[PDB]
C-alpha cells in the first residue's frame, strides 16, 4: 500500500497505489528433556530428525522427538521446540597466547583437539582442528601474509614500521621510512585508511614503495589490527605483513566448531584436547526452565520426568501463561507399571483443567530397530505429538496409538474406573481379525464433567484457539482506526466473515448470524455474539425394532 | 493410505495418496478335545 | 540472415523396468555400476565369474521375455598388477590376478639405435611390438665448414628442454629456446630448422611422432657433418607408442633402461566383502526395479530388503528375489520366509541345472534361478504375471508333489513343478506369491498386483512433476490438467495396464500454488481360477 | 554396542588391514553376534589360521530353523 514511485512529485505525471494484500495457528508442540548437546536454558526449533541429531547428539530427548514425529505417520512432521535441562558448560583450554573454547556444551566437547603449526615455504602459521567422535577435520592454512610490501628504489635504507597506540595497544601508524626520515606515514586517525585496502592502494601509488594484496585469500583487515615488523629489508626481499590477530576473525571465528580469542602472542602449539566440559545437574527449581517458553507460541508441553514436583511446577506455569493471555496444556505420565492407586494419588495432587495424566506404559519399535521399553511420560509425548498433528478442536478419542506392546493390558472395569477418575487410558482391541491399541477417552485431570469445556481437551482447545485468534485479529484490525459511520457495520461484516471461515474449516458447529450485533459509542465498541461449540460423539444408541410383513405372489 | 513420498517435503513436488485397501463375517468354528500332540493350554 | 530451419520429433515412437545384479566377477573395476546391452560388452568388461553366467542366463532365461539394460557390479575389492623398473612405473588396466601374467619388457634395436617395447598376454592372444621408441628426428648437415654440432639440455627445476641450438664450429646459427615462445611441439621446431641454408632436422622416418618440445632428452656435442644424429626423448615418445593400443600403462617417477620380458606382480582379486551395504548404495539412483544378489547369505538378503524398503520410501520402488543352498529342505525355506516376511521380497525354493550357450551343463544353486525369475519378470509387461510361464530349466534337484507345492504356496514360497510334453518347456512357474503370507491382501501378496500399483504411481508422479510444476496458472490450466489425466488413463486402458476408469470422476481444483486432484480406477488382475460348466440335452 | 555388535564388522576391519586375511567360514550363515564369542589368550596368527569358535552361539543358530529339539547351556 505505497505509491509508485515512492517519491511524491508535483509536476504532471501518473502514479499508482497498488494494494498487494488480499492474496495471502500452527499448534506448536514443546518438549523438555535430556540430551548430550545444546546450550543450557535455551530453546531450539526442530523440523527434521537429522537437524535434531546435529544439536541433541544423544539422549532420551532425541528418542522423545522421534516418538512424537512418529506418533502420527498419516500426518505431517510439525514444528517442535526442544530444551536441555542440564546446566552444562563448554570445554575450553588456554595454550599459548590464545583462549580456546568449544561451541559444544557438555563432556563430549572435551574430545575436541586443536593445534597450531607453521609452513616453511610461506613463512605462515597453520591451524588444524580434529574431533574424533564424528571423524571431523578442518585446516585453516596460510595464517598471516595479509599483504606484501616491496621497495624498488636504489637507496641503501628502506624499511617500514607499524606503531601502536600505547594506551590500548591498537595499531595506530604504518610508517614507511627511507634513509633516516619518514617518506610517508599512514596516521590511522580517520579517512578510508581504517581498512588496509586503502593503505595498499596508496602504497602502490608511491613512486618507490609498492604493496600487493595477498593472493593467498583476500583478507581486507582493518588497519588497527595489524602486526608490528621493524628493520626488515624490504628492498632486498619482500616483507610479509601478517596480522594473525586479524586472521583469527577472518578464518577461525566465522567457521569451525572452535572459537578463538586472545588473553600474549599467537604461536604454534601441538594438538591438545580441550577440557572443562561439564554436563551439570538439573536444578531444584524448574520455573526458570519453563519461563523461556513464554513467547514461543507453543500450546502443548511435556517434560521427560515422572516426578510430581515437576508436574506441579508445569501445572502452575501453564495456568500462569493462560492467565497471561497465552493458553497452554500439559500431559504427563507416571513411572513404569504404576498401579491405579498411584494414578489416583497423582490425579488428586493435580485436579487441573490444563493437565492430563497418562497411565499406560509400553514399548515402541524405533526406526533404528530398537524395542525401546519406555515409561508412561514417553507415551504422553506420543499423545501430545498426535494431538499436535490433528487440526484445531479435534479429539484423540478412539484414535490408534501405534505402540508395539503395553505393560498393562486393562479390562473394561479398569478402563471405566480410570475414565471416571479422569485418567487417560489405552486398550488393546482383541475383538477382531487383526489387532491394535486405541485411546479410550481424552478426559483432563479435573474430575467433574459438568463443564465439558474444562473436562474435555478438544473443547478447551477449540475455546482457547478461537478466543486467541479473535482477540489478536481484533487488536490488529480495528484499534487505532477512525470511528466512521460505517465502522460498526464493517466490524459486523468482519466478525461474520471470521465465524463463517471458522465454520467452513469445521472448527465450530454453527452460529446465528443475526445475533452478531455491534454497538459503537465513544472510544468503546461493544459486541455480542453466539456460537454453538463443536462436539465429538462419545455415545451412540440404536433402538432397533423387529416387525413381520406378508407377501403375495 | 501412505503418501508415495512417506515423509512430506517442502519443495515443489507431486504427492500421491492411494486407498491401498480399496482393491480388496467369517463365522469361525472352535473345537476342544483330547489330542496326542501340541501344547497343554495354547 | 535469412535461412531455412528443420525440426524432428521422436517422443511418439515409444517405463522400461530395468533389472539389476550384484555378485562375484573375475574382471572389471570395483564399486562401479555399468550398463549392459550385449553379451560381448559384458565379456569384455567381466572376464569371467558367476556374474557373467547370470547375465547370460538372464538374457536367455525365457524364449520370449528376456530382459534388457542389465546393471551389473563386481563385489571383489581387487587391485591391478604393477611393477617397477629403473625410473619407470608399470601399471595394468585389469583388476585382479589376471594382470600378473601380462608380460612387459624393453629392448634396444641396433640398426635404428632405438629402444623397443614388446608386450605379450597369451590369454587373449595378444602380441605386439612397439619398435622405434624415441628417435623423433634426425639432424643432418650439408655444409663444408670445420665442424657442426648441436646441443639440447634440460632445465633441472622442471626437467624441460631449456634450449635447442645448432652450431657451425663453435658459434651458433640459431637457437630455439623451447621453454618459451610458440615452439611447443617438435614440428614447429623442424619446420623452421629446415629453412636454414645448410642445416636440416628431418623428422624420423618411423612415423610422425610429433612430441612436445620441452620433453626432448639431453644430448650435446654430436657430429652432424658425419652422422644423422638422433634426438630421442624416449619417455615422451612412449606416449605416442602406447597412444591407443596397449593393455599396460606407463609412468616415470630418473632414466629408463631396457630390461627382461618380466611379468607383472601385485595383482589381487581380494576377499569378498562381508556386508554389501556400501556396495548396495551405488544403486540408490540408478532407476532399477528388480535386483537379485548372487549370494545365498541371509544377511545379504536382509541388507537388500532394507535397501529396497529405503528406496521405496524415497519414491523409487524396488523389489527383490532371493534364494540359496542346494536342495534346501522345507524347514529352511519356512525359516527364511519367517525371517524376511517382507512384501517386496520373494523366496525361491528349487535349484537345478541350465544349458549355457557355451555348452556347459551348469548345476547352480537357487539364487541363479531367482536371477532367471527376475529376468523373466522384468521382461514381462507392467502388471503381467509370471504365473504358468515357461522357464526352460533343464532339470531340478527335486520334484515336489501336489501337496508339497500347496504347502509351499500357502507359506508364500515360489516353486516350480515338473510338467510333461508341453509345447515350450517341461517346467512352469506355479505362482507369483511373495513372502508376505496375507493372501487376503492382494497388493502385498501378489507380485504382479503391487508392481502395477507401483509403476502407476511412479509414472503419474514423474509426468505430473515434469509437466505442470514450474509452469503458469491460467484459466485453461485446470481443463488442461483434466484432459492430460484423462488421456493418460485412456492410454493405460488401451495398453491393458488397468481394467477401466470412470472419466467423470476425475476432478481438478486450482487455488494459488496448490492443485487438488481426485480420481477412481478399476485395477488390473490376471486370472487365477477358470471355471467351466457343461449342460447335456437331447431330442427324442 | 555400535557397529561392532556382530562379527561382520570385526571381519571387515581385520581384512581391511593389508597384513591380515580373515575369510569368513563358508559353511552356511553363521554371522554370530560378537558378544557370544569364546575367550582367546594370545593365539599365534602368523603361522596358523586361527578359527574363532563360539560353540553355543552356532549351536543355537544351526538348530533354530531345523528340528524339534531345543538346547540350553548349563
DSSP secondary structure string, A166-228? TTT--EEEEEEEETTEEEEEEETTSGGGGBHHHHHHHHHHSSSEEEEE-SSS----BGGG---
CB environment A53-75: b (16+ within 10 A), e (fewer): bebbbebbbbbbbbbbbbbbeee
Contact A74 B1 (CB under 8 A): yes
* SS3 state at C310: helix
For A497, phi then psi, to 5°, come to: -65, -40
Among D26, D12, D23, CA closest to D49: D23
Among B5, B6, B7, B2, CA closest to C462: B5
State the Cα angle at A282 between A281 and A285, rounded to 5°: 140
Radius of gyration of chain A (CA): 35
- Judge whether B18 is closer than 8 Å to chain C, CB to CB: yes
User: CA A5 from chain center: how many Å?
Assistant: 39
Taking the C-alpha atoms of residue C187 and residue C180, their distance in angstroms, rounded to an integer, is 15
Contact C457 B4 (CB under 8 A): yes
For residue C274, list chain D residues with Cβ-Cβ distance below 8 A: 8-9, 11-12, 15, 24
State the Cα angle at C60 between C54 and C63, rounded to 5°: 155
Residue partners of D6: CB distance under 8 A and separation at least 6: D31, D32, D33, D34
Half-sphere exposure of C439 (CA within 13 A, CB side): 9
Taking the C-alpha atoms of residue A229 and residue A245, their distance in angstroms, rounded to an integer, is 14
**Contact by Cβ (8 Å): A372, A391:** no
Chain C residue closest to B23 (CA)? C523
| Residue whose C-alpha cell is 550398463 | C35
What is the per-residue DSSP string for D7-42? HHHHHHHHHHSTT---PPP-SS----BGGGPPP---
Taking the C-alpha atoms of residue C79 and residue C471, their distance in angstroms, rounded to an integer, is 50
Tally: H helices and E strands in chain A: 12, 26
Calculate the dihedral angle through the C-alpha atoms of C288, C294, C297, C298, rounding to the nearest 10 degrees. 30
| Residue whose C-alpha cell is 615488523 | A229
CB-based burial label for C218 (10 Å; 0-12, 13-18, 19+): middle
Contact C460 B24 (CB under 8 A): no
CB-based burial label for C210 (10 Å; 0-12, 13-18, 19+): middle
For residue B12, list chain C residues with Cβ-Cβ distance below 8 A: 469-470
- Judge whether D34 is closer than 8 Å to chain C, CB to CB: no
Nearest to B20 among C315, C443, C458 (CB): C443
Residue of B5, B7, B23, B24 best to disrupt the C interface, most CBs of C under 10 A: B23
- Residue D45 distance to chain C (closest CA, Å): 18
Among A404, A410, A436, CA closest to A423: A410
For residue B6, list chain A residues with Cβ-Cβ distance below 8 A: 73
Among A331, A535, A521, CA closest to A422: A331
Taking the C-alpha atoms of residue A257 and residue A252, their distance in angstroms, rounded to an integer, is 9
Residue partners of C31: CB distance under 8 A and separation at least 6: C73, C278, C279, C282
Taking the C-alpha atoms of residue C153 and residue C216, their distance in angstroms, rounded to an integer, is 8
Contact B7 C313 (CB under 8 A): yes
Give the resolution to one decimal, in Å: 4.4
A253 secondary structure, DSSP code: I
Q: Count residue pairs from A and B with Cβ separation < 8 A.
A: 6
Taking the C-alpha atoms of residue A58 and residue A34, their distance in angstroms, rounded to an integer, is 8
**Contact by Cβ (8 Å): C293, C322:** yes
**Contact by Cβ (8 Å): A122, A216:** yes
Q: How many residues does chain C have?
A: 540
Among A296, A302, A308, A301, CA closest to A343: A308
| Residue whose C-alpha cell is 529339539 | D69
* SS3 state at C259: coil
* SS3 state at C19: strand
Taking the C-alpha atoms of residue B1 and residue A383, their distance in angstroms, rounded to an integer, is 21
Residue partners of A72: CB distance under 8 A and separation at least 6: A385, A386, A389, A390
**Contact by Cβ (8 Å): C337, C347:** yes
Nearest to C315 among B5, B18, B24 (CB): B5
Nearest to D64 among C297, C329, C335 (CB): C335
- Residue B17 distance to chain A (closest CA, Å): 10
Contact B6 C313 (CB under 8 A): yes
- Which subunits have 3 or more CB–CB pairs within 8 Å of chain A? B
- Judge whether B11 is closer than 8 Å to chain A, CB to CB: no
Contact D8 C299 (CB under 8 A): yes
Bridging pattern class, strands A158-164 and A171-178: antiparallel
Residue partners of A516: CB distance under 8 A and separation at least 6: A492, A495, A496, A499, A527, A528, A529
Residue A402 Cα distances to A67, A73, A361, A419, A426, angstroms: 10, 9, 13, 21, 11
Half-sphere exposure of A471 (CA within 13 A, CB side): 9
- Which subunits have 3 or more CB–CB pairs within 8 Å of chain B? A, C
Taking the C-alpha atoms of residue A90 and residue A277, their distance in angstroms, rounded to an integer, is 5
Contact D65 C332 (CB under 8 A): yes
Regarding chains C and D, contact by 3 or more CB pairs under 8 A is answered as: yes
C526 secondary structure, DSSP code: -
Bridging pattern class, strands C288-293 and C319-322: parallel
Enumerate the β-bridge partners of residue C241: none
State the Cα angle at A537 between A535 and A542, rounded to 5°: 140
**Contact by Cβ (8 Å): C304, C332:** no
Residue C437 Cα distances to C235, C356, C411, angstroms: 68, 35, 6
Taking the C-alpha atoms of residue A491 and residue A514, their distance in angstroms, rounded to an integer, is 14
- Judge whether D8 is closer than 8 Å to chain C, CB to CB: yes
Enumerate the β-bridge partners of residue A212: A148
Taking the C-alpha atoms of residue A506 and residue A378, their distance in angstroms, rounded to an integer, is 31
Residue partners of A300: CB distance under 8 A and separation at least 6: A27, A28, A29, A30, A328, A329, A330, A331, A384, A387, A388
Bin A123: left if φ > 0, else alpha if -120 < ψ < 50, else beta.
left
* SS3 state at C74: strand
Q: Count residue pairs from C and D with Cβ separation < 8 A.
A: 34
Other Cβ atoms closer than 10 A to A31: 25
Contact D66 C335 (CB under 8 A): yes
**Contact by Cβ (8 Å): A488, A520:** yes
- Residue C273 distance to chain D (closest CA, Å): 7
What cell does A258 get? 572452535
Bin C412: left if φ > 0, else alpha if -120 < ψ < 50, else beta.
left
**Contact by Cβ (8 Å): A7, A26:** no
C522 secondary structure, DSSP code: B
Calculate the dihedral angle through the C-alpha atoms of C231, C233, C238, C240, rounding to the nearest 10 degrees. -60
Largest CA distance in chain D: 45
Taking the C-alpha atoms of residue C309 and residue C317, their distance in angstroms, rounded to an integer, is 8
Residue A217 Cα distances to A140, A195, A204, C385, D57, angstroms: 11, 16, 19, 64, 60
Among A53, A38, A74, CA closest to A292: A38
Q: How was this structure determined?
A: cryo-EM
**Contact by Cβ (8 Å): A292, A83:** yes
Enumerate the β-bridge partners of residue C203: C137
**Contact by Cβ (8 Å): C163, C151:** yes
Enumerate the β-bridge partners of residue A238: none
CA A230, A235, A237, A239 torsion-angle sign: positive
Other Cβ atoms closer than 10 A to D21: 11
CB-based burial label for C512 (10 Å; 0-12, 13-18, 19+): exposed
**Contact by Cβ (8 Å): C468, C477:** yes
- Residue D29 distance to chain C (closest CA, Å): 6
What cell does A477 get? 484490525
Taking the C-alpha atoms of residue A297 and residue A81, their distance in angstroms, rounded to an integer, is 10
Taking the C-alpha atoms of residue A96 and residue A119, their distance in angstroms, rounded to an integer, is 18
For residue A77, list chain B residues with Cβ-Cβ distance below 8 A: 7-8
What cell does A138 get? 578442518
Amino acid at each position: 500500500v505505497e505509491p509508485f514511485p515512492r517519491r511524491p512529485i508535483t509536476r504532471p505525471h501518473a502514479s499508482i497505489e497498488v494494494d498487494t494484500s488480499g492474496i495471502g495457528s500452527e499448534k506448536v508442540f514443546c518438549l523438555i528433556g535430556q540430551a548430550e548437546g545444546g546450550e543450557p536454558n535455551t530453546v531450539y526449533e526442530l523440523r527434521n530428525y537429522s537437524q535434531a541429531k546435529r544439536l541433541f547428539r544423544s539422549g532420551e530427548l532425541l528418542d522423545a522427538i522421534e516418538l512424537a514425529w512418529g506418533s502420527n505417520p498419516n500426518y505431517t512432521a510439525g514444528r517442535i521446540l526442544a530444551m536441555r535441562i542440564e546446566d552444562a558448560k563448554p570445554a575450553s583450554a588456554e595454550i599459548g597466547g590464545l583462549k580456546i573454547t568449544s561451541k559444544i556444551y557438555g563432556n563430549v566437547a572435551n574430545n575436541i583437539q586443536v593445534g597450531l603449526e607453521k609452513n616453511t615455504l610461506s613463512d605462515s602459521l597453520r591451524l588444524r582442528v580434529i574431533f574424533q567422535d564424528d571423524r571431523f577435520n578442518e585446516v585453516y592454512d596460510n595464517i598471516g601474509n595479509i599483504f606484501t610490501i616491496k621497495y624498488k628504489g636504489e637507496e641503501a635504507n628502506a624499511t617500514f614500521s607499524v606503531e601502536h597506540d600505547e594506551e590500548t595497544q591498537k595499531a595506530s601508524r604504518l610508517v614507511l621510512k627511507v634513509g633516516d626520515q619518514e617518506v610517508k606515514s599512514y596516521d590511522l586517525t580517520g579517512g578510508a585508511y581504517d581498512y588496509t585496502n586503502a593503505i595498499i592502494t596508496d602504497i602502490n601509488q608511491l613512486p618507490d614503495f609498492e604493496a600487493k594484496l595477498s593472493p593467498f585469500g583476500d583478507k581486507n583487515l582493518e588497519s588497527s589490527k595489524l602486526d608490528k615488523i621493524e628493520n626488515a629489508n624490504i628492498k632486498d626481499k619482500a616483507v610479509y605483513v601478517k596480522a594473525v590477530f586479524g586472521d583469527l576473525e577472518k578464518q577461525t571465528a566465522y567457521n569451525g566448531i572452535v572459537s578463538f580469542e586472545q588473553l600474549k602472542t599467537i604461536e604454534p602449539f601441538e594438538l591438545t584436547k580441550l577440557k572443562g566440559g561439564t554436563n551439570g545437574e538439573p536444578p531444584a527449581t524448574w520455573a526458570d526452565k519453563l519461563d523461556k517458553f513464554a513467547h514461543e507460541g507453543g500450546y502443548y508441553i511435556v517434560p521427560l520426568s515422572s516426578k510430581q514436583s515437576v508436574h506441579a511446577e508445569v501445572a502452575s506455569f501453564v495456568k500462569e501463561r493462560s492467565d497471561a493471555g497465552e493458553p497452554m496444556r500439559a500431559i504427563v505420565g507416571g513411572g513404569f507399571n504404576e498401579s491405579k492407586e498411584q494414578l489416583f494419588g497423582r490425579q488428586a495432587s493435580l485436579s487441573n483443567p490444563r493437565v492430563s495424566l497418562v497411565a499406560n506404559s509400553g514399548t515402541f519399535v524405533m526406526d533404528d530397530g530398537r524395542k525401546n521399553h519406555v515409561p508412561a511420560y514417553m507415551v504422553a509425548v506420543a499423545l501430545g505429538g498426535l494431538a499436535s498433528g490433528l487440526e484445531i478442536g479435534e479429539s484423540i478419542t478412539f484414535k490408534p496409538l501405534r505402540v508395539s506392546s503395553l505393560d498393562q493390558i486393562y479390562e473394561s472395569i479398569d478402563l471405566d474406573e480410570l475414565n471416571e477418575n479422569g485418567i487417560i487410558s489405552i486398550e488393546f482391541v482383541r475383538n477382531r481379525t487383526n489387532t491394535f491399541f486405541r485411546i479410550v477417552d481424552d478426559v483432563t485431570t479435573f474430575n467433574d464433567k459438568s463443564d465439558p469445556v474444562k473436562a474435555e481437551m478438544a473443547v478447551g482447545e477449540a475455546n482457547d484457539f478461537l478466543v486467541s485468534e479473535l482477540k489478536v485479529q481484533l487488536e490488529d484490525q480495528f484499534i487505532g482506526t477512525r470511528t466512521i459511520n460505517t465502522s460498526a457495520s464493517i466490524i459486523k461484516d468482519f466478525i461474520q466473515s471470521y465465524l463463517g471461515r471458522k465454520k467452513r474449516d469445521n472448527e465450530i458447529q454453527d452460529f446465528p448470524a443475526e445475533d452478531v450485533q455491534v454497538i459503537v459509542e465513544g472510544n468503546e465498541a461493544r459486541i455480542s455474539m453466539t456460537v454453538y461449540p463443536i462436539r465429538s460423539f462419545k455415545k451412540i444408541s440404536v433402538s432397533l425394532v423387529y416387525k413381520q410383513q406378508t407377501l403375495q405372489a
